[PDB]
Amino acid sequence: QLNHFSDVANKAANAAGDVIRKYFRKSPVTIADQSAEEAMVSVILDNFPSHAVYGEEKGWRCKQDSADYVWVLDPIDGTKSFITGKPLFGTLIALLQNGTPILGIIDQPVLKERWIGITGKRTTLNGQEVSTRTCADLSQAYLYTTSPHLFSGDAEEAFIRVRDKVKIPLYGCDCYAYALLSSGFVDLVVESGLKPYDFLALIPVIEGSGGVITDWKGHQLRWEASPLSIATSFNVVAAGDKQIHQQALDSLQW
Amino acid sequence: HQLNHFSDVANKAANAAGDVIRKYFRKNNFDLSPVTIADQSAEEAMVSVILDNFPSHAVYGEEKGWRCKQDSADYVWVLDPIDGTKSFITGKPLFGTLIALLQNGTPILGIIDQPVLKERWIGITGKRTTLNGQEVSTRTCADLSQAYLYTTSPHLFSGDAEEAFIRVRDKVKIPLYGCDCYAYALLSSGFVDLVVESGLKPYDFLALIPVIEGSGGVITDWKGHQLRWEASPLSIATSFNVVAAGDKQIHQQALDSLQW
Numbered sequence A: 001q002l003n004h005f006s007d008v009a010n011k012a013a014n015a016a017g018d019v020i021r022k023y024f025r026k027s028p029v030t031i032a033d034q035s036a037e038e039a040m041v042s043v044i045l046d047n048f049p050s051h052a053v054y055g056e057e058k059g060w061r062c063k064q065d066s067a068d069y070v071w072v073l074d075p076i077d078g079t080k081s082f083i084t085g086k087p088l089f090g091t092l093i094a095l096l097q098n099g100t101p102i103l104g105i106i107d108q109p110v111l112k113e114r115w116i117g118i119t120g121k122r123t124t125l126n127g128q129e130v131s132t133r134t135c136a137d138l139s140q141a142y143l144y145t146t147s148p149h150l151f152s153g154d155a156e157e158a159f160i161r162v163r164d165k166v167k168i169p170l171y172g173c174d175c176y177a178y179a180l181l182s183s184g185f186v187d188l189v190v191e192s193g194l195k196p197y198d199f200l201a202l203i204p205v206i207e208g209s210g211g212v213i214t215d216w217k218g219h220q221l222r223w224e225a226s227p228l229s230i231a232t233s234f235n236v237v238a239a240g241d242k243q244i245h246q247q248a249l250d251s252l253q254w
Numbered sequence B: 001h002q003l004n005h006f007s008d009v010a011n012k013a014a015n016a017a018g019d020v021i022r023k024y025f026r027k028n029n030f031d032l033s034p035v036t037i038a039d040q041s042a043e044e045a046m047v048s049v050i051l052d053n054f055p056s057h058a059v060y061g062e063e064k065g066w067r068c069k070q071d072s073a074d075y076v077w078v079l080d081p082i083d084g085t086k087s088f089i090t091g092k093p094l095f096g097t098l099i100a101l102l103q104n105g106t107p108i109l110g111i112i113d114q115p116v117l118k119e120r121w122i123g124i125t126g127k128r129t130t131l132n133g134q135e136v137s138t139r140t141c142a143d144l145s146q147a148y149l150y151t152t153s154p155h156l157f158s159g160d161a162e163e164a165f166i167r168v169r170d171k172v173k174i175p176l177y178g179c180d181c182y183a184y185a186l187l188s189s190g191f192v193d194l195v196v197e198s199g200l201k202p203y204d205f206l207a208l209i210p211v212i213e214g215s216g217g218v219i220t221d222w223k224g225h226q227l228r229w230e231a232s233p234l235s236i237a238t239s240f241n242v243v244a245a246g247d248k249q250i251h252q253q254a255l256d257s258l259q260w
């Protein structure tokens, strides 16, 4: 079973990438997203008809009333990058067992870069093991977030507290920043308002690299995909180094 | 035609920079820097190519300023090996190598090279801009309200310039961030409508001018005047504000908002 999950997840990512390349740098984003999701679901359910799938547009789908295994997909995380021709969007694939991610992929189909997190294994990038880096203090950390405008109210005030303590705040890449953290080139990622399909795949990738990823109180990020689950918004903080993670939590004051 | 020889040599210079840069990119995941080494070495590689071919030309960069075997030169190569140092340091492959050739102070050739992604935009006076040898064009945009805007960082504005940037920012469809010269490359290929930045040095923008103009775009200072900087033995690398647009009409609306 466990190899079979990895093999099928790769086949699904391959199918999504084949689709996406037909649309990149030509509604195109919507057509690409829908076609890539269909391609992934076909692969998944051909192999695992007892599983369920979950995505943004169509929600939960399962040919049975329940499933132990659920695939949570986002064909194009980073829609604004995609629309503007910037090749740092990603396809996100998470497989959840009883609501817990056991596999996550971040795939960049243009750059041909694929991060794979699997419970039990070290994360890989194009098949080679990766690791997060240590970081001596928050003042030395390189921080990413997608946009300064994707924070409001109390969350913006919290972000600013962290932002003003790091070495430098950088912007613009969605899931790719978490990939770079997993590979040891970024120290901290702080975001507000992510939906489950935008973060679940990140969890095994980051943890399997040696990093930490939680909500802004430091609690486990969890969203159990089910027939009745509601795709609510989450705040996320990821770090390469546990000590920097705790400093970030202390600054967020959430 | 001498511009074809200049193009050939510029391409050899970009190839040499890229070979250096690929040796150093994503070497820093174990906690002088790789970025300084890479930058210096890449500049040296380009300079060697340029001056092997053109001993009567000058070169100009950030660290060393003006260099020439003679006291003056008609042709000056202005170089930035790594535009987007923070992207380079953090493993984000959207920095670029910038090469501009100036004849009597005016850019006649510009390259934006991404050596990891293997994407090279070339602007040559007289020709349409190319990306990996294929012609490119900017796109039309119906109104500032429909424009996709990029800038490197929200924090690279201060004072009156920040206030002017905010006026534009709040009028566009969406403001996006993070990628230095690469945003101007995307504008040249017709995927971005507007780029607005403050505080660029000449090695950060001269290469952009032939690229953007040769794709059908417009690039000026914030008053709508020509961006001009004559590289010379006594020139000072001062800071400039830049606005680039795919569409002339959007450019003017942006100038109207900047109120500079």
Ligand SMILES: N[C@H](COP(=O)(O)O)Cc1c[nH]cn1
Binding pocket: A076, A077, A078, A079, A080, A146, A147, A150, A174, A175, A191, A192, A193, A194, A198
């Ligand atoms: N990656 C998050 C979704 O982007 P998209 O919907 O453009 O694909 C970006 C984000 C950060 N905070 C809130 N949303």
Ligand SMILES: N[C@H](COP(=O)(O)O)Cc1c[nH]cn1
Binding pocket: B082, B083, B084, B085, B086, B152, B153, B156, B180, B181, B197, B198, B199, B200, B204
């Ligand atoms: N591309 C400009 C230079 O970046 P670098 O010095 O990190 O390479 C970014 C910039 C915008 N406004 C001011 N500077």
Ligand SMILES: [Mg+2]
Binding pocket: A074, A076, A077, A078, A092, A197, A198, A199
């Ligand atoms: Mg997503």
Ligand SMILES: [Mg+2]
Binding pocket: B080, B082, B083, B098, B203, B204, B205
């Ligand atoms: Mg520069």
